[PDB]
PDB file of C-alpha atoms (C1' of nucleotides) in Angstrom:
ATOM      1  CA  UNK L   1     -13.598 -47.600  -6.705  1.00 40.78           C
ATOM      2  CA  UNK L   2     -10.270 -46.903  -7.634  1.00 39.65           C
ATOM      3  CA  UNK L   3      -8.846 -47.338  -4.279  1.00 38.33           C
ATOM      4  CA  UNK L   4     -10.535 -50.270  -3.302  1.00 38.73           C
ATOM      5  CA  UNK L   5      -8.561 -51.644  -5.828  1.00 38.04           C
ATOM      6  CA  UNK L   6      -5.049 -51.700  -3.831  1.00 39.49           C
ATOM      7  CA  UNK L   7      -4.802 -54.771  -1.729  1.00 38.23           C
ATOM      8  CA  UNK L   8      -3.891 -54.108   2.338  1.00 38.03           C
ATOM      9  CA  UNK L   9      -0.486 -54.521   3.224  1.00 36.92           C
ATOM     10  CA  UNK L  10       1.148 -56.197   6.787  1.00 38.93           C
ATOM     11  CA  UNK L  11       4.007 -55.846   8.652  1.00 38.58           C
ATOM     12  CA  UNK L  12       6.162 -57.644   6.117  1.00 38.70           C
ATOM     13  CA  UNK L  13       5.316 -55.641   3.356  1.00 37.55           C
ATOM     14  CA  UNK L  14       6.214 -52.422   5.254  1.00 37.03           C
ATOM     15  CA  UNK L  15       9.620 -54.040   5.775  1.00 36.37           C
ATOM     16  CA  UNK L  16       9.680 -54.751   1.896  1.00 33.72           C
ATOM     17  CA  UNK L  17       8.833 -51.566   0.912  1.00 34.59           C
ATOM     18  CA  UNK L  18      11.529 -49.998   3.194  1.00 36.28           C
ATOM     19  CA  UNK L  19      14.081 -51.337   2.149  1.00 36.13           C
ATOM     20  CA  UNK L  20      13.271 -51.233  -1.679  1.00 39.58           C
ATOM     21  CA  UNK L  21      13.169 -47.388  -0.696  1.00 42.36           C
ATOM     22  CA  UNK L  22      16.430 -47.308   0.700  1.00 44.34           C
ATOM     23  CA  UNK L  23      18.095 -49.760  -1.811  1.00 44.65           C
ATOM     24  CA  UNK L  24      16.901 -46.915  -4.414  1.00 47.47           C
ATOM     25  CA  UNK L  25      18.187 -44.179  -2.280  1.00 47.96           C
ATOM     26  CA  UNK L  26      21.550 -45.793  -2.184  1.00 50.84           C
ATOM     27  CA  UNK L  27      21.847 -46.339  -5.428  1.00 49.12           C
ATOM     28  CA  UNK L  28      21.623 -42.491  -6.132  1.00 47.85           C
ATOM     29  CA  UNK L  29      23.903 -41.855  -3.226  1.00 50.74           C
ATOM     30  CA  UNK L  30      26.709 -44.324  -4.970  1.00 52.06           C
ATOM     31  CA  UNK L  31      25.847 -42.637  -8.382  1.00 51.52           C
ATOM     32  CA  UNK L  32      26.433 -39.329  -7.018  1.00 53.98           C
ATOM     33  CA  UNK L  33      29.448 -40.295  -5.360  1.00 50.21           C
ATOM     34  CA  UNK L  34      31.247 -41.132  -8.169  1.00 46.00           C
ATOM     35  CA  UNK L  35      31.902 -37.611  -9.443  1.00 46.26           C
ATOM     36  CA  UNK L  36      34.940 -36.187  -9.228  1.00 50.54           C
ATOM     37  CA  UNK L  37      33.220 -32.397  -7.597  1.00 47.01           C
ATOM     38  CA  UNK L  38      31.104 -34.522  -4.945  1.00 47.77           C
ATOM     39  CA  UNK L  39      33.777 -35.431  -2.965  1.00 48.29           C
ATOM     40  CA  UNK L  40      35.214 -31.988  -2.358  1.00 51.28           C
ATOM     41  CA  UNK L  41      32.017 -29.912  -2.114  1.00 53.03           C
ATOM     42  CA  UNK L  42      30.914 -32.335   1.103  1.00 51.33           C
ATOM     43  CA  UNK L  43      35.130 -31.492   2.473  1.00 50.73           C
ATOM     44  CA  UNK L  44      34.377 -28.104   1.968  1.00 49.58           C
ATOM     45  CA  UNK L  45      31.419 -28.157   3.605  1.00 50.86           C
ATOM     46  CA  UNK L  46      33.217 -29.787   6.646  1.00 51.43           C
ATOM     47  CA  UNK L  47      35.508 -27.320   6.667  1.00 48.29           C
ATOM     48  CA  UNK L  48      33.147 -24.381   6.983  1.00 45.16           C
ATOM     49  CA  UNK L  49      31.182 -26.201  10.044  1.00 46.26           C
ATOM     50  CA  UNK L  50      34.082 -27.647  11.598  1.00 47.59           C
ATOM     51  CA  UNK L  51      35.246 -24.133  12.194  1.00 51.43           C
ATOM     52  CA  UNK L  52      32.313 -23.178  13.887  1.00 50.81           C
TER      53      UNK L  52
ATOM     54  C1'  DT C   1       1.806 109.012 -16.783  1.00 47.58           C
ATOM     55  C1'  DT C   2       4.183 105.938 -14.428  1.00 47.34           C
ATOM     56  C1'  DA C   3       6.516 103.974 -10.490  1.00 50.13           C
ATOM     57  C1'  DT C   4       4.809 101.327  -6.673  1.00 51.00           C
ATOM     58  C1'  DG C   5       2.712  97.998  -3.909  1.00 51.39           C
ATOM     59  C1'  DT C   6      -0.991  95.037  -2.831  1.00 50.31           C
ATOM     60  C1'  DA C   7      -3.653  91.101  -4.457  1.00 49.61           C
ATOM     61  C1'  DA C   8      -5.596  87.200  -7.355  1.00 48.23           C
ATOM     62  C1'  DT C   9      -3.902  83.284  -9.539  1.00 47.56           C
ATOM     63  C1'  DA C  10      -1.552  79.522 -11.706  1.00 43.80           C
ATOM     64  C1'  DC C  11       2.373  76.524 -11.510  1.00 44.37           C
ATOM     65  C1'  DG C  12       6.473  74.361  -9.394  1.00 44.29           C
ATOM     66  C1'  DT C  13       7.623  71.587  -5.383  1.00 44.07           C
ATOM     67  C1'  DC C  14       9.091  69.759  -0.791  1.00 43.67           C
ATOM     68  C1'  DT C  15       7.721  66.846   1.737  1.00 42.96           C
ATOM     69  C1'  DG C  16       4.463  63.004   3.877  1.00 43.81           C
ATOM     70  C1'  DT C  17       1.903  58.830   2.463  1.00 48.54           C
ATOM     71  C1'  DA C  18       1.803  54.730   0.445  1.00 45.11           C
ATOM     72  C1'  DA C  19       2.713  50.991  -2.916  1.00 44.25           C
ATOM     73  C1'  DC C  20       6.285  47.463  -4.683  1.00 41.67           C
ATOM     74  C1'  DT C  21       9.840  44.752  -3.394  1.00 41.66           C
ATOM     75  C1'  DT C  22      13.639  42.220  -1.170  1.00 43.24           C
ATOM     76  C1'  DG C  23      16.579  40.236   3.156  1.00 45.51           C
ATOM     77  C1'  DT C  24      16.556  37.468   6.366  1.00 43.58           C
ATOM     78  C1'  DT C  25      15.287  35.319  10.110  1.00 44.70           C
ATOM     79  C1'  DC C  26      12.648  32.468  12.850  1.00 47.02           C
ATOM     80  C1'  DT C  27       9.215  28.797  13.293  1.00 46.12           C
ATOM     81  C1'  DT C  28       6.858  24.723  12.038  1.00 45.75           C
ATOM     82  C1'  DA C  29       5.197  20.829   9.364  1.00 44.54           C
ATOM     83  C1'  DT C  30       6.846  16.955   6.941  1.00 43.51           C
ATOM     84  C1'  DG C  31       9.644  13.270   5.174  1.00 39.23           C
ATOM     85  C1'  DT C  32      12.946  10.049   6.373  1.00 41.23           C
ATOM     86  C1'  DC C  33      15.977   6.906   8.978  1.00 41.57           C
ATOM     87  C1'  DT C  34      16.472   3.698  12.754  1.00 43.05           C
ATOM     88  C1'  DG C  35      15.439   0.740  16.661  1.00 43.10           C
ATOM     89  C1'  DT C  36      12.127  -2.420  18.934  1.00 41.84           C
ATOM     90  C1'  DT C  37       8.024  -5.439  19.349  1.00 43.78           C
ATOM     91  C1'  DA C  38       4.278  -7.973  17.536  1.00 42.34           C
ATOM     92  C1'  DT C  39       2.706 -10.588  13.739  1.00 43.42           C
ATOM     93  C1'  DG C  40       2.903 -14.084  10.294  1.00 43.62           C
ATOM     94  C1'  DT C  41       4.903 -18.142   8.447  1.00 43.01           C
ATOM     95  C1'  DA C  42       6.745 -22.848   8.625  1.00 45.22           C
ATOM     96  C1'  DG C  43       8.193 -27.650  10.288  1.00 45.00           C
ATOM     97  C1'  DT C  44       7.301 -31.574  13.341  1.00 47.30           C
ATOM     98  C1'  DT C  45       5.156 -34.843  16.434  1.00 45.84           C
ATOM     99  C1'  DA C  46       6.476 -42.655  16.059  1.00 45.74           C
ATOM    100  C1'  DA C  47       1.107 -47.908  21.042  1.00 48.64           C
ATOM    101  C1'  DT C  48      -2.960 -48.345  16.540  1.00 53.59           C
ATOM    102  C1'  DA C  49      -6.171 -46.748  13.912  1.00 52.55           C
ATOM    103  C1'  DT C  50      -7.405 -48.577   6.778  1.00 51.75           C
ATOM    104  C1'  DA C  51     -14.729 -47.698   1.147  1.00 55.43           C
ATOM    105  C1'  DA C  52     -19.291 -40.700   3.316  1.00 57.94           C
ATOM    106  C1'  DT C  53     -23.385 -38.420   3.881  1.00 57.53           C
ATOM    107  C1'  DT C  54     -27.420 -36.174   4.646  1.00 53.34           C
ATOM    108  C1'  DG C  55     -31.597 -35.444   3.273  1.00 53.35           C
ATOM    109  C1'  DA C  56     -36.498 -35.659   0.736  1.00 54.38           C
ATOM    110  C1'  DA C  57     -40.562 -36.095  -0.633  1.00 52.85           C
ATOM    111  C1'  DG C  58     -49.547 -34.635  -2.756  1.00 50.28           C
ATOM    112  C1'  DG C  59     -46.870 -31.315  -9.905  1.00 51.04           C
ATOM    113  C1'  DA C  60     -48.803 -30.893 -14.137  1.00 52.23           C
ATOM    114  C1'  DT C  61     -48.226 -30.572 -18.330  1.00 51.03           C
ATOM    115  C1'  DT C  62     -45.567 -30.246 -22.840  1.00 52.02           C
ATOM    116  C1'  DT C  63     -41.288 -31.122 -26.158  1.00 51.14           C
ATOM    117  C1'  DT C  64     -37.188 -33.693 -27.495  1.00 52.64           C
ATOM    118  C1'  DA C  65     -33.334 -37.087 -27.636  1.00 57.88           C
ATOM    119  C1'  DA C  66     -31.731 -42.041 -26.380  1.00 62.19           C
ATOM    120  C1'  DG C  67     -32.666 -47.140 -25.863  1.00 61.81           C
ATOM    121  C1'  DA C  68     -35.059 -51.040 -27.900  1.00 63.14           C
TER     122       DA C  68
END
DNA sequence: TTATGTAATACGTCTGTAACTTGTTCTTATGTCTGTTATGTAGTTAATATAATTGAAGGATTTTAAGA
């Protein structure tokens, strides 16, 4: 019963849904990027693999 | 009578046994460390697919809460 109560979705709404997820994702990614310690933690990470 | 010399006898006693004890020396059982292999855990896969499930059955009486 409870469910049955959730309509079926198509094609379209999988393509809706998508990119509602992603919109949301970068949204976080563009709030986390504005901090001053993001920035270098990802550079430092670079570093470390660059070398291997 | 009395010196003398043998003889019984009781007590030290020198030595042979044995107990107490330690050195030390060798052997072995055990605990531990380390290296290798098997076991146990975990993550991923992209035609599409979109309301179970399986039974089960001749019961006969009481008492006690819900519904009206």
């Amino acid at each position: 019963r409870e469910m049955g109560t959730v309509e079926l979705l198509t094609r379209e709404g999988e393509i809706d849904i998508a990119k509602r997820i992603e919109d949301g994702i970068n949204q976080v990614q563009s709030a986390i990027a504005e901090y001053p310690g993001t920035i270098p933690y990802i550079l430092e990470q670079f570093d470390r693999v660059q070398a291997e």
